[PDB]
């Protein structure tokens, strides 16, 4: 039971957040953020650039100074603050969910039940890690006492995308704050609003000034300034593989700041002939169409064994044809519009390429509404590995169904990609499941399920889908700088 | 008790090692490797370039294929192989120590008692880790069974320096092989001999073909080919900060391969007025002059509290003057020549800058011999923070002694650097020791000691001294790719 | 810092047996009185649980632990949510619980409020974070197999606690147990059952499924022994005397081989080196001994002082002991309340006479401090020798022992020459002396330049006969986990 | 292929091992050890009692004193010593395998290929743990620095059984010595020889005097003296559930020494209808009959689904009838004699009980030879849960086959036992495998296999099958005493 939404939530925050205060861009410039459902401007937002990032980094560095309130704060207390932040977010859950839908386009029911829930679970999970990421006492040779201190990496630049505005912010802040780091976050220009409101909650929660600084703005400007900053110790980025390369280059070209990347993919969803048909069809649908197809780990390569190909395709088409597209604020809406005009056009371009290359168009393929950025649920059959839609990340409601014969064959085809974010296996057989999960070159391998995320379980990509992991205990690794202290002792004993 | 060395050890390996076989460079080109003590050529060595690296990567990739001998091998057996390799290196200890000295220049007594001992301890330590780096079973929400597999990152490109040829090879091979990875190693052009002989021992130990491949050659050629290779999954580099930046940029500009760096420093060695004078003086001497001053973590900024400054300096100068420079094969030799002419000239250049800038030359200052790359143990007193010799890594037998008054002052001065590899504190006071070890922004802080390395304790730098850590359990992190497997289960129970 | 005014006569709302989130009278309908140690008067009667009541509690716990039950299926993260909720409810009723603790126990209200309750909240909140983080392992075993371990709950946990820290001991037990999905049958101390029973009401209010936590107030040889000997209790955690510790382990072995962890007493040495900060060491040595009316398991009951500073250290310690305010625990000026009961009161008086009889120099106190209640004067014995009974046995009262020593090698030997090894401390400014001593001392916790510094993050437990196993920190989860290895045959094992 | 065995290996050690020396019992008494294949006395062995244990404990205590050679020894060197012992054991493998067979009765081929191999793997695995079991640095509240030291528990009393003499000794010594503890081992009166010979190797390997002391003798005498000793810090026992209780009572009655127990069981081996018939039959045979049925985790309750019951039974009887029983030194022998006359008669008694209670005798059931303790491979069909042979541990070549219908039924019947050491599931279905592995109350659950031991994976029982775990990292826990050191610092920072 979801509370009735305010289909027109008021915007209270639209500036640059530094030292728990709101500031206009030094240039005084602003940029519009659009409601993808109507194509209308919601409001103006401060356009942060290099100079604003500089102010943000200085504030973060000051908050990270030895002896500061944030540095002296008990680890357990950082946990207390993260829990308080989660409580505040829960209080304002109905509002944030509506605002998320307004600025992003995803169905309100999904914003409320899925996104906001995961945000709360991520923040509360990491709050528990605050005073538990122990260093080590080491039995080194000789008369010495050796141990390690798990110190904060320092000033962390965090650049996030627009597909899960609130969630991406939580996946970043959770681990960083739990370990005592300070943040300079650059939210996506397409979805800056919700993250900015949470900044107000961060101040209300009690976090010292400068611990979390948010700079809304464009990528080549604000984003690059963070990645190239001489005083940013670490950068965490989630987005396109293309910009991931730019980030890494900027890091190497500047102060050698530590880097972790969460990029895209072309994840293979493998359906074996012994899989539960009804379950696999529904899960394959969800795997691809979830969040308007705007998911990094989307099951965009649906491999189906020949014996069950026809039936699976028929059922998948029927499911795609009945998928409700419309106003994200209407409870019956399963799919809202795409984030912006650029994505809208790019997706339509991919559908055209799909038709041109010989992929069999089974349903959809065009615009779903005359207003907004709505696209019809599209399904392509008889897709070949060499096809563009079978290789490139579409990031829209466009499903690819491929046919295979043997298990050995599908492993090779699934792995024949520059991406490796995720994969899935649908089978009732124990050996097939273990054979495939071990063989698949992907960060996450789901068996008889898809898009199952847990704050306890790490997520990240193999190959060019990224480096490093987020969520779980692993999510703390990149936010820790290790110091070894080796002390001479009179006489070491076991 | 050190066995009498063969002052002219025969060279058996001087080619490119691929698939457990010796090959000439595709171009058939060779480069000379010089004996720094005499300036004479030892022998010619195959000059590996891009085409040779390509062959090496393909061999490594083949050896890493699923179902291959190396992939199927029990983790405990990889441990058995590492132990076997250690035994073979111990069998040929006297020979390797002599060859190390011949090619590098360091005293034979040191090569035998220190370098070789550390190589053996490193390999035997990692041998034990082979079957103990567990993944995790995670209590994720919902009806799921979630766990992680700690798989090998893959084809690892390993680029190492010339200061500790065998030890650097060990620090790289140990963690990589322990975790089931395959290697393409680029040894330093100044010291390729000892590493090539070890390749023979790797074959003798029983490691499958392609598991370890070694390509001797230059940096911009062979090294850059590895860093930019589209099929290399991870690169580990040890060397200058300048080239470290080049490596990270190459990785980002290519296939987003994972990166870890071990660069230089300008490590501060702080002597508080309550320190044991005799011990502090001897340790500070060792901290700087060890291995001809060619140590990444050399104590190149000796901070001495004003009350004991004069006495400390007087004793330091006396010790530097008594240091025996000469033939590394002579038991009485404490300091051999610098690695090559380039380093020789660079050091003399820094000494000149020290004189030009007003630092007080207290002893040494020039060449120590008319043949070979020998430099006199040099000590500069009254060094100021703004001086070139106080900021840049000299990598030679040139000591800088600075004066300070308060503990608060020295912390700021010690940390005022783009480097942060190591640091040391000499004091008898508990509080001062804890205050300093916590406040110093350095990868390793030594208290009442220096250059105390243990295979069990991690080593790495803060800031621009590098990223990631080697040695200890931490050394396994960069050689692991994490995979999450999440399986739907009938009903999850605790 | 600031403390809300206490209700010096807090109303008692819970005084029965807690099973399946409901209150029950003992099957026998028997009740026992709990006394206010400050006045010696009866506060109220409490249901007297016995074997038959324990059996019911164990059966309820077993049912709550059945596969498919709400508590077994509950997401680990949610168990953490429930623990945080319980902590919030305890904080809401902090002032009430602080006063009730003082009424039943006797400790100063200011301490119950600022110390005990604070530590309770911190313990529960720490463990809530552990709920979904105590991972099992995936193991690189030889051959074509996939091997891993599940960290399952040990099962029905019997927890028997003492009276010196009623609420805190309850929290130290519940936190790790609930965080790991176990169920509990807790036997609170007969001298202080009230606060734990009220917390049961908060456990129900928090949302814990019925049977997850069951509390049986009653005596030791009856209710406590029934838990230790129970054929369906999988694990027992006990805190109290070394003697009952042995009885518990024997009962475990003679019954179903239930797993056992013990937190017993000690005769903890507090070593003061000649280079220590005098003022700091004196104040800390006083605290180390006299805290909680000297009723602390890890009390620094053997104060070793280096000869060169002995005279001055003693003079300052005596003056500090003489200035210690003894009186009504509800009065803000009060530093020391009464001992927990008449039995302890008499036992301490006996040890004081024992000290005088064996030759220890009585420096101050040594008698009854008040006509009513169980108040004892802060007592200090000087020139104590290792062979004295007051130097060997746990007094558990406001009785300090000061011993003199010369060298660091000597003090290590004397401090370790004991059947106890719960804790120890070292006061020195020297790096080497601190490292030499912390390594050499055979104790569970070694404090350097401090004492009684507990952290929910750091393990606590004894060496030798001071106990086995550890509580608090990550280590506190070990005893509440039963490890299962699952080894599956796979087509072809690859790294 | 296995080397030719010396069918009558010379006995070199038969006394009490204390301080790396051989002693007779204080009472000068000895006891005979018998060859179970002929019933003939091999030799006399010193009968250790309380006074001998007292001498061993004092020696162990002395070796454990602070500052002793064993206490000061580098953790890494303890690993070196364990690896050396393994090497000596491997050098004398042919001899030890033959001696094991002579004293125990198990087939020489198995002693050589299985027992000795596992002994080597156990010691080599733990050798690797010596310097890797780290303590922690903890982020405690307030201005303190808190850390934990993982110290050795101290003097460890280790009492082991006769079913796997050498292996049981290795499972105890490996973890204990890896963590720096000292040992007073009490070997089984039925099989003291091999352990005593290894004591010689322990001395030859270089372990300091008193680190390992071995006292051969009886249970109520030497064993009980160890369990009740006032100066033994920890006791690890493997044997019967009955004596396990006696050990725990002794510990509680004495000095509260820490306790871990590895007892027996009545492990259920579950065969679902979709299991691989051939594989399940051979594995079920192995599961029960392995080691003359003298295995703690023997699959003595073979549950078979009704649909495949008749066929499974027919194949199981045929396999049991073909099992070769005879001279353990003959390469064709699969089953040697039982350990002694006591066990021999106990098993026959159980077989008679099985017949009286209504179980269907399908094959065997009697003595297999007129000399030695040989018993025919016996199989009972239509066994019911209430039958004595279905509840009590037989420890002989007596198989129980029960029929079941549903999965919920088999899980409940399998769990309806006071034991819970191990269990197994044979099925091709993923969900069935996961459901059973989770629901079964057993220390180890094998899936599509049985008796798969790995030094890397823990082993131990649920309920009355024991407490604590051996093998893996978990095996180190009981050998560690944890010490927390909390230090006041001037100002704590993250
Ligand atoms: N951190 C260290 O341990 C360390 C080691 C050696 C040198 N140094 C520093 O570096 C200074 C210069 O010495 P150097 O030139 O021999 O160090 P370097 O960084 O140039 O060489 C290190 C390794 O990287 C390879 N390399 C060089 N250029 C490369 C490139 N363009 N792409 C890929 N790999 C490349 C080299 O061949 C060698 O194998 C030294 O004086 C000292 O200050 C530091
Ligand atoms: Mg872009
Ligand atoms: Mg260079
Ligand atoms: Mg009592
Ligand atoms: Mg017996
Ligand atoms: Na928008
Ligand atoms: Na050279
Ligand atoms: Na009371
Ligand atoms: Na025998």
PDB file of C-alpha atoms in Angstrom, chain D residues 13-188:
ATOM      1  CA  UNK D  13      59.870 -46.095  18.900  1.00  0.00           C
ATOM      2  CA  UNK D  14      57.723 -47.546  21.676  1.00  0.00           C
ATOM      3  CA  UNK D  15      58.278 -45.321  24.710  1.00  0.00           C
ATOM      4  CA  UNK D  16      57.124 -42.023  26.210  1.00  0.00           C
ATOM      5  CA  UNK D  17      58.299 -38.912  24.325  1.00  0.00           C
ATOM      6  CA  UNK D  18      59.212 -35.991  26.609  1.00  0.00           C
ATOM      7  CA  UNK D  19      61.660 -33.163  25.873  1.00  0.00           C
ATOM      8  CA  UNK D  20      62.678 -34.844  22.604  1.00  0.00           C
ATOM      9  CA  UNK D  21      63.785 -37.906  24.569  1.00  0.00           C
ATOM     10  CA  UNK D  22      62.498 -41.457  25.021  1.00  0.00           C
ATOM     11  CA  UNK D  23      61.473 -42.563  28.501  1.00  0.00           C
ATOM     12  CA  UNK D  24      59.970 -45.683  30.022  1.00  0.00           C
ATOM     13  CA  UNK D  25      56.884 -45.316  32.203  1.00  0.00           C
ATOM     14  CA  UNK D  26      57.733 -44.308  35.787  1.00  0.00           C
ATOM     15  CA  UNK D  27      56.094 -47.605  36.783  1.00  0.00           C
ATOM     16  CA  UNK D  28      58.208 -49.421  34.158  1.00  0.00           C
ATOM     17  CA  UNK D  29      54.971 -51.061  32.996  1.00  0.00           C
ATOM     18  CA  UNK D  30      54.255 -51.723  29.318  1.00  0.00           C
ATOM     19  CA  UNK D  31      51.254 -52.829  27.277  1.00  0.00           C
ATOM     20  CA  UNK D  32      51.076 -54.920  24.087  1.00  0.00           C
ATOM     21  CA  UNK D  33      49.901 -53.537  20.758  1.00  0.00           C
ATOM     22  CA  UNK D  34      48.414 -56.099  18.366  1.00  0.00           C
ATOM     23  CA  UNK D  35      48.370 -56.678  14.611  1.00  0.00           C
ATOM     24  CA  UNK D  36      44.591 -56.977  13.921  1.00  0.00           C
ATOM     25  CA  UNK D  37      45.205 -59.087  10.803  1.00  0.00           C
ATOM     26  CA  UNK D  38      46.723 -61.971  12.782  1.00  0.00           C
ATOM     27  CA  UNK D  39      45.919 -61.256  16.411  1.00  0.00           C
ATOM     28  CA  UNK D  40      49.653 -61.401  17.170  1.00  0.00           C
ATOM     29  CA  UNK D  41      51.548 -58.981  19.415  1.00  0.00           C
ATOM     30  CA  UNK D  42      53.675 -56.509  17.446  1.00  0.00           C
ATOM     31  CA  UNK D  43      55.657 -55.285  20.464  1.00  0.00           C
ATOM     32  CA  UNK D  44      55.383 -53.812  23.954  1.00  0.00           C
ATOM     33  CA  UNK D  45      54.785 -50.085  24.481  1.00  0.00           C
ATOM     34  CA  UNK D  46      55.453 -47.983  27.596  1.00  0.00           C
ATOM     35  CA  UNK D  47      52.261 -47.653  29.636  1.00  0.00           C
ATOM     36  CA  UNK D  48      52.043 -43.969  30.490  1.00  0.00           C
ATOM     37  CA  UNK D  49      49.963 -42.941  33.504  1.00  0.00           C
ATOM     38  CA  UNK D  50      49.397 -39.838  35.666  1.00  0.00           C
ATOM     39  CA  UNK D  51      53.019 -39.419  36.767  1.00  0.00           C
ATOM     40  CA  UNK D  52      54.173 -39.624  33.154  1.00  0.00           C
ATOM     41  CA  UNK D  53      51.587 -37.046  32.127  1.00  0.00           C
ATOM     42  CA  UNK D  54      52.771 -34.771  34.965  1.00  0.00           C
ATOM     43  CA  UNK D  55      56.324 -34.944  33.579  1.00  0.00           C
ATOM     44  CA  UNK D  56      55.060 -34.173  30.061  1.00  0.00           C
ATOM     45  CA  UNK D  57      52.974 -31.192  31.222  1.00  0.00           C
ATOM     46  CA  UNK D  58      55.903 -29.680  33.138  1.00  0.00           C
ATOM     47  CA  UNK D  59      58.117 -30.076  30.055  1.00  0.00           C
ATOM     48  CA  UNK D  60      55.407 -28.466  27.908  1.00  0.00           C
ATOM     49  CA  UNK D  61      54.982 -25.632  30.433  1.00  0.00           C
ATOM     50  CA  UNK D  62      58.736 -24.994  30.470  1.00  0.00           C
ATOM     51  CA  UNK D  63      58.887 -24.891  26.669  1.00  0.00           C
ATOM     52  CA  UNK D  64      56.048 -22.340  26.756  1.00  0.00           C
ATOM     53  CA  UNK D  65      57.705 -19.882  29.178  1.00  0.00           C
ATOM     54  CA  UNK D  66      58.020 -16.292  28.003  1.00  0.00           C
ATOM     55  CA  UNK D  67      61.428 -15.830  26.380  1.00  0.00           C
ATOM     56  CA  UNK D  68      61.867 -19.513  25.505  1.00  0.00           C
ATOM     57  CA  UNK D  69      63.106 -20.611  22.038  1.00  0.00           C
ATOM     58  CA  UNK D  70      59.557 -21.643  21.051  1.00  0.00           C
ATOM     59  CA  UNK D  71      57.924 -18.422  22.318  1.00  0.00           C
ATOM     60  CA  UNK D  72      60.444 -16.077  20.642  1.00  0.00           C
ATOM     61  CA  UNK D  73      60.572 -18.022  17.368  1.00  0.00           C
ATOM     62  CA  UNK D  74      59.261 -16.047  14.385  1.00  0.00           C
ATOM     63  CA  UNK D  75      55.751 -17.115  13.384  1.00  0.00           C
ATOM     64  CA  UNK D  76      57.066 -17.715   9.847  1.00  0.00           C
ATOM     65  CA  UNK D  77      59.728 -20.061  11.214  1.00  0.00           C
ATOM     66  CA  UNK D  78      57.067 -22.178  12.968  1.00  0.00           C
ATOM     67  CA  UNK D  79      55.672 -22.588   9.444  1.00  0.00           C
ATOM     68  CA  UNK D  80      59.115 -23.603   8.176  1.00  0.00           C
ATOM     69  CA  UNK D  81      59.335 -26.251  10.915  1.00  0.00           C
ATOM     70  CA  UNK D  82      55.895 -27.639  10.007  1.00  0.00           C
ATOM     71  CA  UNK D  83      56.955 -27.865   6.341  1.00  0.00           C
ATOM     72  CA  UNK D  84      60.149 -29.653   7.383  1.00  0.00           C
ATOM     73  CA  UNK D  85      58.153 -32.207   9.394  1.00  0.00           C
ATOM     74  CA  UNK D  86      55.968 -32.771   6.333  1.00  0.00           C
ATOM     75  CA  UNK D  87      59.103 -33.360   4.251  1.00  0.00           C
ATOM     76  CA  UNK D  88      60.444 -35.921   6.730  1.00  0.00           C
ATOM     77  CA  UNK D  89      57.076 -37.668   6.837  1.00  0.00           C
ATOM     78  CA  UNK D  90      57.050 -37.812   3.023  1.00  0.00           C
ATOM     79  CA  UNK D  91      60.633 -39.162   2.971  1.00  0.00           C
ATOM     80  CA  UNK D  92      59.490 -41.985   5.297  1.00  0.00           C
ATOM     81  CA  UNK D  93      56.092 -42.391   3.596  1.00  0.00           C
ATOM     82  CA  UNK D  94      56.490 -46.026   2.479  1.00  0.00           C
ATOM     83  CA  UNK D  95      57.608 -47.047   5.958  1.00  0.00           C
ATOM     84  CA  UNK D  96      54.890 -45.091   7.823  1.00  0.00           C
ATOM     85  CA  UNK D  97      52.139 -46.417   5.531  1.00  0.00           C
ATOM     86  CA  UNK D  98      53.252 -50.001   6.199  1.00  0.00           C
ATOM     87  CA  UNK D  99      53.527 -49.420   9.967  1.00  0.00           C
ATOM     88  CA  UNK D 100      50.083 -47.776   9.951  1.00  0.00           C
ATOM     89  CA  UNK D 101      48.608 -50.862   8.263  1.00  0.00           C
ATOM     90  CA  UNK D 102      50.424 -53.278  10.575  1.00  0.00           C
ATOM     91  CA  UNK D 103      49.075 -51.627  13.742  1.00  0.00           C
ATOM     92  CA  UNK D 104      45.652 -50.497  12.466  1.00  0.00           C
ATOM     93  CA  UNK D 105      44.722 -53.083   9.840  1.00  0.00           C
ATOM     94  CA  UNK D 106      43.679 -50.757   6.988  1.00  0.00           C
ATOM     95  CA  UNK D 107      44.864 -51.586   3.421  1.00  0.00           C
ATOM     96  CA  UNK D 108      48.445 -50.522   2.708  1.00  0.00           C
ATOM     97  CA  UNK D 109      47.378 -48.978  -0.614  1.00  0.00           C
ATOM     98  CA  UNK D 110      44.927 -46.765   1.283  1.00  0.00           C
ATOM     99  CA  UNK D 111      47.425 -45.937   4.059  1.00  0.00           C
ATOM    100  CA  UNK D 112      49.902 -44.814   1.409  1.00  0.00           C
ATOM    101  CA  UNK D 113      47.592 -43.052  -1.041  1.00  0.00           C
ATOM    102  CA  UNK D 114      45.013 -41.658   1.379  1.00  0.00           C
ATOM    103  CA  UNK D 115      46.174 -41.357   5.015  1.00  0.00           C
ATOM    104  CA  UNK D 116      49.767 -40.304   4.353  1.00  0.00           C
ATOM    105  CA  UNK D 117      48.638 -37.933   1.595  1.00  0.00           C
ATOM    106  CA  UNK D 118      46.107 -36.248   3.886  1.00  0.00           C
ATOM    107  CA  UNK D 119      48.672 -36.044   6.700  1.00  0.00           C
ATOM    108  CA  UNK D 120      51.088 -34.220   4.382  1.00  0.00           C
ATOM    109  CA  UNK D 121      48.362 -31.900   3.087  1.00  0.00           C
ATOM    110  CA  UNK D 122      47.154 -31.075   6.601  1.00  0.00           C
ATOM    111  CA  UNK D 123      50.609 -30.150   7.924  1.00  0.00           C
ATOM    112  CA  UNK D 124      51.544 -28.197   4.789  1.00  0.00           C
ATOM    113  CA  UNK D 125      48.258 -26.269   4.929  1.00  0.00           C
ATOM    114  CA  UNK D 126      48.699 -25.278   8.570  1.00  0.00           C
ATOM    115  CA  UNK D 127      52.343 -24.406   7.963  1.00  0.00           C
ATOM    116  CA  UNK D 128      50.916 -21.655   5.788  1.00  0.00           C
ATOM    117  CA  UNK D 129      48.686 -20.334   8.589  1.00  0.00           C
ATOM    118  CA  UNK D 130      51.566 -19.833  11.060  1.00  0.00           C
ATOM    119  CA  UNK D 131      52.091 -16.128  10.289  1.00  0.00           C
ATOM    120  CA  UNK D 132      48.666 -15.184   8.918  1.00  0.00           C
ATOM    121  CA  UNK D 133      46.165 -15.463  11.821  1.00  0.00           C
ATOM    122  CA  UNK D 134      46.005 -11.702  12.477  1.00  0.00           C
ATOM    123  CA  UNK D 135      44.668  -9.929  15.547  1.00  0.00           C
ATOM    124  CA  UNK D 136      42.791  -6.615  15.107  1.00  0.00           C
ATOM    125  CA  UNK D 137      43.136  -2.830  15.558  1.00  0.00           C
ATOM    126  CA  UNK D 138      39.708  -1.640  16.761  1.00  0.00           C
ATOM    127  CA  UNK D 139      38.041   1.811  16.363  1.00  0.00           C
ATOM    128  CA  UNK D 140      36.871   2.010  19.987  1.00  0.00           C
ATOM    129  CA  UNK D 141      35.044   5.063  21.419  1.00  0.00           C
ATOM    130  CA  UNK D 142      37.118   7.770  23.094  1.00  0.00           C
ATOM    131  CA  UNK D 143      40.791   8.750  23.075  1.00  0.00           C
ATOM    132  CA  UNK D 144      42.171   5.244  23.032  1.00  0.00           C
ATOM    133  CA  UNK D 145      44.030   2.911  20.736  1.00  0.00           C
ATOM    134  CA  UNK D 146      42.596  -0.585  21.085  1.00  0.00           C
ATOM    135  CA  UNK D 147      43.906  -3.781  19.520  1.00  0.00           C
ATOM    136  CA  UNK D 148      43.907  -7.539  20.048  1.00  0.00           C
ATOM    137  CA  UNK D 149      46.797  -9.986  20.266  1.00  0.00           C
ATOM    138  CA  UNK D 150      46.100 -13.551  19.183  1.00  0.00           C
ATOM    139  CA  UNK D 151      48.251 -15.448  21.641  1.00  0.00           C
ATOM    140  CA  UNK D 152      48.604 -19.243  21.980  1.00  0.00           C
ATOM    141  CA  UNK D 153      46.158 -20.850  24.416  1.00  0.00           C
ATOM    142  CA  UNK D 154      49.139 -22.598  26.032  1.00  0.00           C
ATOM    143  CA  UNK D 155      49.597 -26.233  27.050  1.00  0.00           C
ATOM    144  CA  UNK D 156      47.276 -28.282  24.867  1.00  0.00           C
ATOM    145  CA  UNK D 157      46.136 -31.750  25.856  1.00  0.00           C
ATOM    146  CA  UNK D 158      45.321 -33.767  22.764  1.00  0.00           C
ATOM    147  CA  UNK D 159      43.625 -37.155  23.050  1.00  0.00           C
ATOM    148  CA  UNK D 160      43.039 -39.069  19.811  1.00  0.00           C
ATOM    149  CA  UNK D 161      41.466 -42.361  18.575  1.00  0.00           C
ATOM    150  CA  UNK D 162      42.700 -45.347  16.544  1.00  0.00           C
ATOM    151  CA  UNK D 163      40.719 -45.193  13.277  1.00  0.00           C
ATOM    152  CA  UNK D 164      43.162 -42.801  11.558  1.00  0.00           C
ATOM    153  CA  UNK D 165      46.288 -42.751  13.815  1.00  0.00           C
ATOM    154  CA  UNK D 166      48.631 -40.610  11.694  1.00  0.00           C
ATOM    155  CA  UNK D 167      45.885 -38.355  10.302  1.00  0.00           C
ATOM    156  CA  UNK D 168      44.334 -37.674  13.709  1.00  0.00           C
ATOM    157  CA  UNK D 169      47.799 -36.743  15.031  1.00  0.00           C
ATOM    158  CA  UNK D 170      48.273 -34.317  12.104  1.00  0.00           C
ATOM    159  CA  UNK D 171      44.826 -32.693  12.577  1.00  0.00           C
ATOM    160  CA  UNK D 172      45.800 -31.914  16.173  1.00  0.00           C
ATOM    161  CA  UNK D 173      49.449 -30.906  15.720  1.00  0.00           C
ATOM    162  CA  UNK D 174      49.058 -28.743  12.610  1.00  0.00           C
ATOM    163  CA  UNK D 175      46.760 -26.019  14.088  1.00  0.00           C
ATOM    164  CA  UNK D 176      48.290 -26.191  17.566  1.00  0.00           C
ATOM    165  CA  UNK D 177      51.902 -25.759  16.391  1.00  0.00           C
ATOM    166  CA  UNK D 178      51.001 -23.225  13.688  1.00  0.00           C
ATOM    167  CA  UNK D 179      49.755 -20.896  16.442  1.00  0.00           C
ATOM    168  CA  UNK D 180      52.678 -21.539  18.803  1.00  0.00           C
ATOM    169  CA  UNK D 181      51.109 -23.836  21.389  1.00  0.00           C
ATOM    170  CA  UNK D 182      52.794 -26.774  23.125  1.00  0.00           C
ATOM    171  CA  UNK D 183      51.415 -30.322  23.203  1.00  0.00           C
ATOM    172  CA  UNK D 184      50.900 -33.326  25.473  1.00  0.00           C
ATOM    173  CA  UNK D 185      49.321 -35.915  23.180  1.00  0.00           C
ATOM    174  CA  UNK D 186      47.715 -39.151  24.329  1.00  0.00           C
ATOM    175  CA  UNK D 187      47.532 -41.638  21.473  1.00  0.00           C
ATOM    176  CA  UNK D 188      45.209 -44.638  21.309  1.00  0.00           C
TER     177      UNK D 188
END
